[PDB]
């Protein structure tokens, strides 16, 4: 098989997957949803114990075996081969949820090309009766139904949720978003068609640009008057609501989606080169840079929110309460509309979001494309381009049902149900298979001399008890706590809750059904069946 070549492209790819628009969206959103300051204190130890061991162990396993992501299990535990299809379905769902955000971001980038951005005021295609958020000389009387120009732009222009009365009501089509998704899919298909060479070559040009745009946006937002209330609200200890009913589980899920363990991308990036004496270093640096960029995004978001609250002369905890994922697209839009240096900051921020989401979804799709090819050699021989075209077709077919519907309700449902308990159970079964079933002693007896140092006394005790204990605790809390959802003054009905629970349960039923298929295809009694089926080849 081919190799990554030079370590620089591999490091760039890992850090590019680390910097994720999904994380930049979810971290400050749930932060402000739970209360802001009471989100970072019970977060650091969970982030460490969820990212460091899983990422490091999976990178080491990939660099040691080099058999893709699905075929890498044939030499460890062939009973749990269904995890390949599980993570494939998970990646399909995550891509279907990411495509709508990508289309929204690119449509915003297109609409932000005119000299007069359509955010300072409401034009002939917006409800001016409720469009009254204009900073005047104390002549505004906010009521229980007042809205914002950016809110109207996100609601009745790009989404048109006014035509849909919920999930049970069908919504109108959107040709603009349709062509946007078409263009995004052709771009990503032309990007993946070449191969791992252009994969590693395309990350370097899109590596420092998001960082520099983030830095200039931060130094621009930190200068506006009102950058103190935001940071004071973001840096509150708040030791009152963190014991049991806090945001610990949501923070765990957020850092899980950020680090991306078990998503197949790590095994994909490690199945190319051995990367001697640098696996632990790369894992540590990518984890700390992901934590740093997430912290910086949350910091700048809360700074802009505090600035807006001080400009509006209102408390920070009441602006955009019921707003879901719109928070970014509304607050940053209002900030750029208020900034006298517009028409440039919005463009560079939209370009940042576009390239970030592109590299994220590209790595996510490659992590499945290079695994299914290793699983099917008759396809990997010649039909690679045909299969990637077919997977692009099926991905856009799956994303059509959530794009053409014209409603963010299914988007929020997938955001709160697809990247949660299913991938949590996937990570749990992967960890228990690599720790309990597969001997940790013989697992480390090679990676020790492979990386030069001894991983003992930390992972020998972390991979066995505390990590699976925390995983099972998070999973049980998720299964026991009913995930109530609200978005744009719309309560999710019990039928939608049941549908979400059913899709979350069936998203990982492939692993137990494959276990059943294996135990019914293996002859003999149960004892000899298991003891001759779970054999590392």
């Amino acid at each position: 098989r081919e190799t990554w070549g030079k370590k620089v492209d591999f490091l760039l790819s890992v850090i590019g997957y680390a910097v994720d628009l999904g994380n930049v969206w979810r971290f400050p959103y749930i932060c402000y949803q739970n209360g802001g300051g009471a989100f970072l204190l019970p977060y650091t130890i969970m982030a460490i114990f969820g990212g460091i061991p899983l990422f490091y162990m999976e990178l080491a396993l990939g660099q040691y075996h080099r058999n893709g992501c699905i075929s890498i299990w044939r030499k460890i535990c062939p009973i749990f081969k269904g995890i390949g299809y599980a993570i494939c379905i998970i990646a399909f769902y995550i891509a279907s949820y990411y495509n709508t955000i990508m289309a929204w971001a690119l449509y915003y980038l297109i609409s932000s090309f005119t000299d007069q951005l359509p955010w300072t005021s409401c034009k002939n295609s917006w409800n001016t009766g409720n469009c009254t958020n204009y900073f005047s000389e104390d002549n505004i009387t906010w009521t229980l139904h007042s809205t914002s120009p950016a809110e109207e732009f996100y609601t009745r222009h790009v989404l048109q949720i006014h035509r849909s009365k919920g999930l049970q009501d069908l919504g109108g089509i959107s040709w603009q978003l349709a062509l946007c998704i078409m263009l995004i899919f052709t771009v990503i298909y032309f990007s993946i068609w070449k191969g791992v060479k252009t994969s590693g070559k395309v990350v370097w040009v899109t590596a420092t640009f998001p960082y520099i745009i983030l830095s200039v946006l931060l130094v621009r937002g930190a200068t506006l008057p009102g950058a103190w209330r935001g940071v004071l609200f973001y840096l509150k200890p708040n030791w009152q609501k963190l014991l049991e009913t806090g945001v610990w589980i949501d923070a765990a899920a957020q850092i899980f989606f950020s680090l991306g363990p078990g998503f197949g991308v790590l095994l994909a990036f490690a199945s190319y080169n051995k990367f001697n004496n640098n696996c632990y270093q790369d894992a540590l640096v990518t984890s700390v840079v992901n934590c740093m960029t997430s912290f910086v995004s949350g910091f700048v978001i809360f700074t802009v929110l505090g600035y807006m609250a001080e400009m509006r002369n209102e408390d920070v905890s009441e602006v955009a309460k019921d707003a879901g994922p719109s928070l970014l697209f509304i607050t940053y839009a209002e900030a750029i509309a208020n900034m006298p240096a517009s028409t440039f900051f919005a463009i560079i921020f939209f370009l940042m979001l576009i390239t970030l989401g592109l590299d994220s979804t590209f790595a996510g799709l490659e992590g499945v494309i290079t695994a299914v090819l290793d699983e099917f050699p008759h396809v990997w021989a010649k039909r690679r381009e045909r299969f990637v075209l077919a997977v692009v077709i099926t991905c856009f077919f799956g994303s059509l049902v959530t794009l053409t519907f014209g409603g963010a309700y299914v988007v929020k449902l997938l955001e709160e149900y697809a990247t949660g308990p299913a991938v949590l159970t996937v990570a749990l079964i992967e960890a228990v298979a690599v720790s309990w079933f597969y001997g940790i002693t013989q697992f480390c007896r090679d990676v020790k001399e492979m990386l030069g140092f001894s991983p003992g006394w930390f992972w020998r005790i972390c991979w066995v008890a505390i990590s699976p204990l925390f995983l099972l605790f998070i999973i049980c809390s998720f299964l026991m706590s009913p995930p109530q959802l609200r978005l744009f003054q719309y309560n999710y009905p019990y039928w939608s809750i049941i549908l979400g629970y059913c899709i979350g349960t069936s998203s990982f039923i492939c692993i137990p059904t494959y276990i059943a298929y294996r135990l019914i295809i293996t002859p003999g009694t149960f004892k000899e069946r298991i003891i001759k089926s779970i054999t590392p080849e």
Epitope: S121, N124, S125, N127, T128, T132, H157, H162, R163
Partner: antibody, heavy 118, light 110 residues
Framework: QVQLQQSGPELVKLGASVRISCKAS????????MNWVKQRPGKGLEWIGR????????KYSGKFKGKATLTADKSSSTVYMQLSSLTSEDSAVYFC??????????????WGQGTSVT | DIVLTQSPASLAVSLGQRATISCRAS??????????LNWFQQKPGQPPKLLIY???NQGSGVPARFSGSGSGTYFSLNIHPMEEDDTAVYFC?????????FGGGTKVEI
């Protein structure tokens, strides 16, 4: 409410200029558009242009951008229409209508008494 | 530009019968599920009066006899049998961007 009071009649001369005022009150005039129509005696209606108070945005059309100009005044809550090269063709009555909101379809619900510019 | 054409030009409908007014164009003014169309009532000497809101809802203070429907390109203005006082020239307005244009006009009588 209905308080779109306009000015009285004026005299039209060849190569002149007349200003028509439109006093708006009773609602948020700085958030709704201000439309101006042109009706000839014994003819239909002709749209001149629109103006958005508080922002200065104007959209002139209907071969009238060369001789018609709209001006808003947030202090006096009045709308002014600048004219030029007055002729017997454009010498007719002019109204001052206020458009509706977005969900209402931007309809001219409120009108004025009329300004007979003859 | 977007020009409107009305038909018919004159409707001498007697008292006790309904009538219909059409306003055709190249639009297709449908945008965000809101039919961009406005119907006005112009009386001789009196200023115009709004009748239908976005060609779907009735105006403010207007009688229940006024109604209107239609979508896409063709639009119908179905009016209940009126009296000798509701006779007035009606106009259709296209409020879609970026320019606004009025209709031709109808001459309803007995």
């Amino acid at each position: 409410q209905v308080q779109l009071q306009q000015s009285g009649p004026e005299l039209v001369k060849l190569g002149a200029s007349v200003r028509i005022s439109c006093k708006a009150s009773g609602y948020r005039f700085s958030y709704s558009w201000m439309n101006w129509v042109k009706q000839r005696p014994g003819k239909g209606l002709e749209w001149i242009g629109r103006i958005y108070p508080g922002d200065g945005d104007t959209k002139y059309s209907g071969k009238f951008k060369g001789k018609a100009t709209l001006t808003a005044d947030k202090s006096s809550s009045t709308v002014y229409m600048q004219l030029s090269s007055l002729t017997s063709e454009d010498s007719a009555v002019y109204f001052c209508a206020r458009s509706a909101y977005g969900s209402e379809g931007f309809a001219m619900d409120y009108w004025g008494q009329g300004t007979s510019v003859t | 530009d977007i020009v409107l054409t009305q038909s018919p030009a004159s409707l001498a409908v007697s008292l006790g019968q309904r009538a219909t007014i059409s306003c055709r164009a190249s639009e297709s003014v449908d945008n965000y599920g809101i039919s961009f169309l406005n119907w006005f009532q112009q009386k001789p000497g009196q200023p115009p009066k709004l009748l239908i809101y976005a060609a779907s809802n009735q105006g403010s203070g207007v009688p229940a006899r006024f109604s209107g429907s239609g979508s896409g390109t063709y639009f119908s203005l179905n009016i209940h049998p009126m009296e000798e006082d509701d006779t007035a020239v009606y106009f259709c307005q296209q409020t879609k961007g970026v320019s606004w244009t009025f209709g031709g006009g109808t001459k309803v009588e007995i």
